[PDB]
């Protein structure tokens with residue numbers, strides 16, 4: 086699902102891609 | 103020559119470009135989130151697509167290097183990260199479709215609004231519109247309007263899409279040889295092949311249920327107490343032996359019961375620890391709040407924040423000249439670049455949130471010592487538990503007095519101790535049944551233990567039995583009330599909130615011993631224990647290089663999650679609730695509803 090996360094939060098799918 | 107030579111060649115090259123491409127991407131994402139423009143959206147999309155492109159290509163070329171032939175474990179772990187991830191075996195036609203469903207569902211969540219039956223064209227959103235009602239309203243039918251309108255107007259648009267989500271998600275999960283997509287998600291906690299520290303997916307269910315059963319006695323008494331109180335505040339509307347109505351729980355879904363504190367407070371005649379007014383009398387600003395968090399981590403022996411954290415961070419809302427996303431978020435951009443984004447207000451809540459957010463920074467900074475692909479928390483519940491324990495110590499009267507937000511003569515007593523524990527339980531213990539139930543429902547839907555013609559039937563049964571929470575109005579299979587929550591419509595695991603909750607109390611007990619705390623655990627501040635920060639840093643540092651079971655064991659001396667520490671924290675409240683509830687009914691009819 087991941088590999089490396091850049092910001093601790095669960096951002097909305099529309100604007101985090 | 104060898105194949106393990108070619109693998110290191112392969113990695114050293116991947117890491118070089120990935121370190122650059124990851125940063126160009128996180129930097130664009132930061133720009134957008136700090137300053138929402140079309141050009142920043144564009145850079146973020148462009149930079150998003152390059153990393154995705156790279157990471158797809160690389161992942162495929164990683165298969166040429168099968169782990170069996172690789173003797174170096176660092177290199178293996180990296181090659182595994184890469185091989186597993188960056189892979190969608192779902193066909194490009196369907197992926198396209200699923201990528202759309204996710205977007206549409208996400209949009210409908212943010213966009214959708216309920217225009218008032220009455221009102222011509224006044225339209226409330228969920229935020230801040232309906233959420234202001236569902237937190238602050240003390241009117242049954244106003245809360246019920248917001249609750250129902252939300253589920254019957256927005257949720258019913260998600261039902262067609264979420265049904266199709268489950269199909270494509272389960273195809274994707276089974277193309278990787280997982281039983282189902284719930285099984286894939288349980289895979290985050292999977293340690294296989296580390297003799298002595300292994301953990302299987304089905305084991306997670308076993309420990310979640312075993313731990314939950316040990317928590318039922320406490321929630322039962324919390325629920326009984328809260329219900330006895332909501333009868334005073336909503337006489338005529340609540341059965342004394344029934345479930346709590348779903349629209350009366352202090353937020354849109356009842357995820358937290360935090361907003362019921364004023365209704366349910368054990369001793370209101372006592373002072374409220376809130377220090378927001380001392381913060382304001384002492385003219386605290388955002389800088390101060392964040393320089394005080396920095397001092398907390400330095401006291402346990404962790405580093406200071408970087409120069410670049412103070413230069414590049416947005417710690418306040420930039421006005422109307424600039425559009426920022428004001429969700430508190432800690433950032434790890436790469437290449438030594440760490441930033442927090444937060445619209446800090448001079449409030450006790452934000453003070454504690456600052457400590458939660460900077461804790462993620464300390465985590466990210468720690469595991470910078472790790473190779474790129476191992477720069478992650480040990481499991482989806484570790485980062486949140488790291489956040490929560492910082493907030494646990496900073497909220498104590500000991501610490502506030504140490505920083506001068508509380509008078510040296512504050513009278514912490516038994517009543518003061520019980521009010522705190524009650525407010526804490528309403529937030530921490532209250533979300534445990536709601537969290538377990540929700541992920542259970544989802545596990546079961548993905549598995550196929552729930553037919554589409556019973557999704558909402560099972561949802562509300564499960565709510566009644568597990569959560570003790572009944573719908574105020576009958577809902578058919580035209581509804582998708584699950585997806586009316588951010589994480590369900592936005593495709594995110596929810597068990598992380600359960601696991602992080604046990605972890606956090608497991609961690610605090612160990613750090614409070616390391617720090618040699620005297621009294622009850624809820625009054626513990628690891629503030630000046632370098633031995634506590636030492637113990638903590640040795641786990642932060644690992645990132646995801648070791649199994650989460652060894653990571654955990656480093657801090658707590660045990661290889662699995664465990665509920666004794668959480669239950670020891672609320673023990674005084676637990677014995678208080680039992681003495682209180684002895685003339686009330688403990689337990690709930692699963693059949694009584696307000697529409698009976």
Ligand SMILES: *CCC(=O)N1CN(C(=O)CC*)CN(C(=O)CC*)C1
Nearest residue numbers: 087088089090091092094095096101
């Ligand atoms: C490993 C992937 C990652 O870094 N994340 C991005 N993400 C998504 O893929 C959704 C758009 C969810 N994550 C975050 O919200 C990070 C801020 C993690």
Ligand SMILES: [Zn+2]
Nearest residue numbers: 093458486489
């Ligand atoms: Zn957090």
